[PDB]
């Protein structure tokens, strides 16, 4: 069983989005597909549920009204599609199919969520896709510099060092939402301070929407 | 609508401890059908408990689940070092289902103060007009901290932003990073740019500055 959602996605607001979920492996008419979404740093809200033989569907008060949840049985395929976008919806949304209770998955239905798809994070927002600026946060036994990865949109944006050769002391932290809506994130590493003279420091930053790919020497001075 | 409440929000335990985590319903889950989910930072969660008490298997024996009602409990028999994670209830005995907000287990460990540094602005930046000043807090326990920048002694509001990473899997500590943002011109009318640190593991606050 194997649930596969559909890729990220940017939404102005007032808008709607649709997400959909692809399952393959055991009998999608029969058992119970629901839809859970998680804000950033926040817990899982349950949002509804469907079972596609039935058509029967529930919605969780919150977003009734602004919610539909269709199951496609010819395609084995469920969709989530929420209304009238705001900043609060700016979340990971998944699929989550219940489990059944032996070997195989034509088991008898146990309710709870066994299988989950891997999350599409739908950012609403005005703003437009934009590469970073990298800024050096220069060095002063134990010395600290970084990498400013400052106004950049949309998420995500991974950094490292060194091309991977430099891990220890390293710390990436998640991204700050600025108020023009662009997005910021630094990297640190603490090094020794006597290795400032004959080691090199690089931090390689990717955010691929905006093809931006930097890699940026940190030094003293 | 049913209420879960998972309290408390989090638990600091030592490796090898035993865990035992409330979910409390404001009324009776019918036909105790409570589960338990396990979730770890970028990842799905993954469900380790149904019907109260009933485990599937592939999910580890150190986790079982009790209670009816109102009343349930999720035990962790012993802390291996994957388990420090946040663990959610849910019921789903209604045509409604609900979540708890949620119980974070993380590693408990001595009181570490920060190290701290500040960074200013690097003249790249400020060509552009801009001036961001960094302050790093790293490598602490407990996971509470707090700085606040004063500029040539003015406590700064609502020019700053704070980022804090999870739990260090080696050490267990925490680091933060604040950015404190003005224009180029604004950042030229101040000579004394200081972040300023609080937290357990020091006595006294900690201020770290330069001069422009």
């Known amino acids: 069983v194997q649930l596969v959602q559909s890729g990220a996605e940017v939404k102005r607001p007032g808008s709607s989005v649709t997400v959909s979920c692809k399952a393959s492996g055991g009998s999608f008419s029969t058992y119970a597909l629901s839809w859970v979404r998680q804000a950033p740093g926040r817990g899982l809200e349950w949002m509804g549920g469907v079972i596609p033989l039935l058509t029967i569907t529930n919605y969780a008060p919150r977003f009734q009204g602004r919610i539909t949840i269709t199951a496609d049985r010819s395609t084995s395929t469920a969709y989530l599609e929420l209304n009238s976008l705001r900043p609060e919806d700016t979340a990971v949304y998944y699929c989550?199919?219940?489990?059944?209770?032996?070997?195989?998955?034509?088991?008898?239905?146990?309710?709870?969520?066994?299988?989950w798809g891997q999350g599409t994070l739908v950012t609403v927002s005005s703003a437009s896709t934009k590469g970073p600026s990298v800024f050096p946060l220069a060095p002063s036994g134990t010395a600290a510099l970084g990498c400013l990865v400052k106004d950049y949109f949309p998420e995500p944006v991974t950094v490292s060092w060194n091309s991977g050769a430099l891990t220890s002391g390293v710390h990436t932290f998640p991204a700050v939402l600025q108020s023009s809506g662009l997005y910021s994130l630094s990297s640190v590493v603490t090094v020794p301070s006597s290795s400032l003279g004959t080691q090199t420091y690089i931090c390689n930053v990717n955010h691929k929407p905006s093809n931006t790919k930097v890699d940026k020497k940190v030094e003293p001075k | 609508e049913i209420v879960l409440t998972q309290s408390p929000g989090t638990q600091s335990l030592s490796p090898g401890e035993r865990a035992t985590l409330s979910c409390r319903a404001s009324?009776?889950?019918?036909?105790?059908?409570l589960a338990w989910y396990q979730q770890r930072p970028g990842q799905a969660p993954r469900l380790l408990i149904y019907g109260a008490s009933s485990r599937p298997s592939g999910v580890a024996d150190r986790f079982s689940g009790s209670g009816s009602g109102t009343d349930f409990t999720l035990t962790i028999s012993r802390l291996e070092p994957e388990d420090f994670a946040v663990y959610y209830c849910?019921?789903?005995?209604?045509?409604?289902?609900?979540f708890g907000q949620g119980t974070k287990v993380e590693v408990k460990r001595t009181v570490a103060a920060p190290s701290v540094f500040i960074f200013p602005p690097s003249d790249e930046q400020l060509k552009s007009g801009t001036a961001s000043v960094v302050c790093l807090l790293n490598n602490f326990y407990p996971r509470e901290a707090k700085v606040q920048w004063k500029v040539d002694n003015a406590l700064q509001s609502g020019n700053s932003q704070e980022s804090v990473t999870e739990q260090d899997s080696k050490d267990s500590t925490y680091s933060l990073s604040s950015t404190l943002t003005l224009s180029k011109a604004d950042y030229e009318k101040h000579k004394v740019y200081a972040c300023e640190v609080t937290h357990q593991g020091l006595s006294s606050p900690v201020t770290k500055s330069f001069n422009r």
């Open positions: 849910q019921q789903y005995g209604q045509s409604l289902s609900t």
């Open positions: 009324q009776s889950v019918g036909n105790n059908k």
């Open positions: 989550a199919r219940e489990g059944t209770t032996g070997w195989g998955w034509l088991g008898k239905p146990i309710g709870a969520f066994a299988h």
